Paper text:
Specifically, the β-­glycosidic bond of 6′-P-β-glucoside is cleaved by 6-P-β-glucosidase (6PβGlu; EC 3.2.1.86), releasing 6-P-β-glucose (BG6; glycon), an important cellular precursor, and the remaining portion of the given substrate (aglycon). Here, the high-resolution crystal structures of GH1 6-P-β-glucosidases from Lactobacillus plantarum (LpPbg1) and Streptococcus mutans (SmBgl) and their complexes with ligands are reported. 6PβGlu is a single-domain protein that adopts a (β/α)8-barrel (TIM-barrel) structure, which is a typical fold of GH1-family members. The GH1-family enzymes utilize a double-displacement mechanism of catalysis with retention of configuration at the anomeric C atom of the glycon moiety.
Numbering used by the authors:
A (entry chain B): 2 to 477
B (entry chain A): 0 to 477
The structure:
Amino acid sequence: SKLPENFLWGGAVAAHQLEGGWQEGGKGISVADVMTAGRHGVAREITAGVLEGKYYPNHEAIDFYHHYKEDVKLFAEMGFKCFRTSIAWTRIFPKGDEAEPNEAGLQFYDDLFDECLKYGIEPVVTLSHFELPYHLVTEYGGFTNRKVIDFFVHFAEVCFRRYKDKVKYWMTFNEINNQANYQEDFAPFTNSGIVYKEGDDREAIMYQAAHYELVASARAVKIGHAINPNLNIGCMVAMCPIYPATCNPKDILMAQKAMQKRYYFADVHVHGFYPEHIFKYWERKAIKVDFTERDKKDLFEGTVDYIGFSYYMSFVIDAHRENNPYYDYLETEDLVKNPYVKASDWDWQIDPQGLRYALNWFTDMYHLPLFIVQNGFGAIDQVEADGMVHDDYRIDYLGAHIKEMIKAVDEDGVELMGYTPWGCIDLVSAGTGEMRKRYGFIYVDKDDEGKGTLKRSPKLSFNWYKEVIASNGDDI
Amino acid sequence: AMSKLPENFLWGGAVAAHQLEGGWQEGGKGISVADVMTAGRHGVAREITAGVLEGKYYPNHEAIDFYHHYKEDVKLFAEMGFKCFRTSIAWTRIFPKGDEAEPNEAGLQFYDDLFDECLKYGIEPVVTLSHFELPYHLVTEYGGFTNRKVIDFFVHFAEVCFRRYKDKVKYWMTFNEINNQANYQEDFAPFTNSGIVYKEGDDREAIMYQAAHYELVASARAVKIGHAINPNLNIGCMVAMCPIYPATCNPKDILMAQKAMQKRYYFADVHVHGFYPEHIFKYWERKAIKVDFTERDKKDLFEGTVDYIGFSYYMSFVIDAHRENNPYYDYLETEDLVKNPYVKASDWDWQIDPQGLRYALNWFTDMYHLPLFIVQNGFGAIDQVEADGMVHDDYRIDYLGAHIKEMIKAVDEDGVELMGYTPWGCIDLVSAGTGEMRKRYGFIYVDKDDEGKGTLKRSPKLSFNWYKEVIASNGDDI
Ligand SMILES: O=P(O)(O)OC[C@H]1O[C@@H](OC[C@H]2O[C@@H](O)[C@H](O)[C@@H](O)[C@@H]2O)[C@H](O)[C@@H](O)[C@@H]1O
Ligand SMILES: O=P(O)(O)OC[C@H]1O[C@@H](OC[C@H]2O[C@@H](O)[C@H](O)[C@@H](O)[C@@H]2O)[C@H](O)[C@@H](O)[C@@H]1O
């Protein structure tokens, strides 16, 4: 085979997107519990707490909390070699600032992790995934507050210890670089728990939180390895490679400066220091960041073991916008459409070839092992009279990507730990809080009005993926 | 009130021993590879003759007699106010055949006198150990750098120079533009980079990779002994940086660009990181290229990484996926590249893209986080002397000006770490590619034509006083 024997095939999810039981076992209100439903072309509403008259899809989600044994069993039917999820911060520390963790909460993950380990499924765990306690947001302002660093490090330490011999693979902060787009409220609210107000420099406040998180990460990495040196602790960034529209030298420069801005987090996770261009940017913009000598030391001592990343699409930038003499990157303004590729009904361009670019790029910059912890295809699914979703459009997409990651390993020589398709069981979509935007090999009976039996049934892609794993990639 | 560039920025001018020196037999200097290369023209290759052949014109034999003129010439460098001066040590001046037990004293003394003369004016020498001029005996007798035995010979040479000049030269580089031979389809680079003489049947690519590996090992070893002799020496690598742009956002074009860069600059990853990128090893399998490569070599490479990246910039390239039957995205420099439709070009069809210099600087910075040194940049054009007795080379001034502006942006806005800036061919010399005098790069005009005649008189061009003023104001006033 072309992939190494122990290659980690699996499937990915996040606590707040699937678990449900948002109030069970003392679980506290998380940022996710206050975001209402939306849709393609309509933003999710972020409320000042749980308001009457609103629908909050994450509250009940797909009730994985009461269903996990049945679902894990399916994951084992496909033959997962691993399973990625996050530990819900608000199940361990309801409000965030407690001196002691919620035991019921630790127990739930004990029970979940034991369940996977029965079938030989190695857990892969993300510490923060879009679900910090909503209390740290109201009470402290989220990761704008330096003291929240220690709250995260407490939470991580607790988690490392309880699971030091059950969980081999960890990631600190989910897609730490989504907030690179400070222009809208989603990323800053979910990466970082930032609610903006009048006169706030949104960009300035984003960089501070990002810095606190990068520093929280480096401290957590360090502490993990002390507890169990064998732990593998990685970072996690959303990779959307950014292509220059043409060989016009300005487009070229725009592309390079955009990548630099979108992925400086990686350089810090990896090299242990900020690149010079960020400081130059801050000076230019008069952005001041609370950045200490101790921070600088934590960052250099807390670099990651591998890079985990999501991949769904690629972008294209050009130099069309004038009044940009410094070549700033505006995610909401500088991006144009790639004429050479197709897209989803949500307009996420489909570019499997970009997965290979990405893998090569990470490899060339960083020379660390890599882990595709999210890749997937969100689409409308229908049920055929035969009772099964025939999702060949999903199979085609996953398929084309696998073929490219294999080329990268076999022809290019990148070290890739594994591959984890995203939303492996139908779940509440992050960007939209939509059920109708489905990603799973497994269909869950529930719609965007929250009606349905919630019964699960396999999709056409279920057996397909099963054969993929069993063939270790030789059968696409 | 500070400048955008550091106060100790190393402004200077660059050349190579075999293109200006002459005295190609003086002091027992041996025949080098350049001494058997005839003169050419744009479109017409120089001829690589087997030995020095009667009835053939070899322009490097006399060049501009800098060997006799150096003192007055260095005086001109001082007049413009150079902070540094870059040249190479002619290998064949130290080891005429290359395999001697003991070095040549007269050759050593020459560079002693030359370096002394620079320092009399406060000009810091920047030295390149191998610059397209290895001993020709090593070609005929050993097969050049295709022979593991030449690693030793080179390191012995590096060692002698490091010793002799350990308190005179602070800035060194090992192999000039070591990556040119990435273009192995044509004879030039492989023969100048590496002393390779191909015959019918050769796997040109495979042989290039071997010589390159040996030079990379020889480079690591030189770095290590240089530092042992004096840990303060700055010893760098030297690569030709022609950045390679994808034609369009077609993913296939994007990938051709990334893979081309990977192919053309792996040299740098080795110099900097101290090991090969995996993609090379993978590539070598697909091609069944066998490279003689010991654990000892592994160790040397990993331990002799460089202090800084010296590079040359002249232009940007463009690539696309138009070529058929390339399912693995191999890179052929003579076939995959297309013209940039957005820029202008010199009379020798070199494209002018100063913004590409800024891209280059960020690329090195992003990949390697080392100090960079722009050690060659220049504009080759036809000069004519006006009635005031001076060449009015505004074209040159404009070219250099534009590049300098971009590099300032890289520093002042992008934060790259740049040690200095060395316009190439600061004095009119014999060109690499063509062995031409008419392709002038200089701030200083040398009266000598392509038929070998002229008084060899030196005189300032208009750019002379321009550069002087660029330096005096540390780039403030371009
Ligand atoms: O549910 P969604 O909206 O389809 O998102 C998919 C899945 O991937 C990750 O985020 C997806 C993307 O959402 C935006 O922030 C940007 O377009 C991208 O940067 C980002 O990758 C999340 O990890 C996950 O929770 C999402 O459900
Ligand atoms: O060949 P020229 O006109 O002298 O210009 C090159 C000059 O700078 C450096 O570049 C070498 C060039 O040789 C050509 O054959 C290639 O096509 C170019 O890509 C390459 O840059 C040399 O280091 C120097 O010796 C040359 O004089």
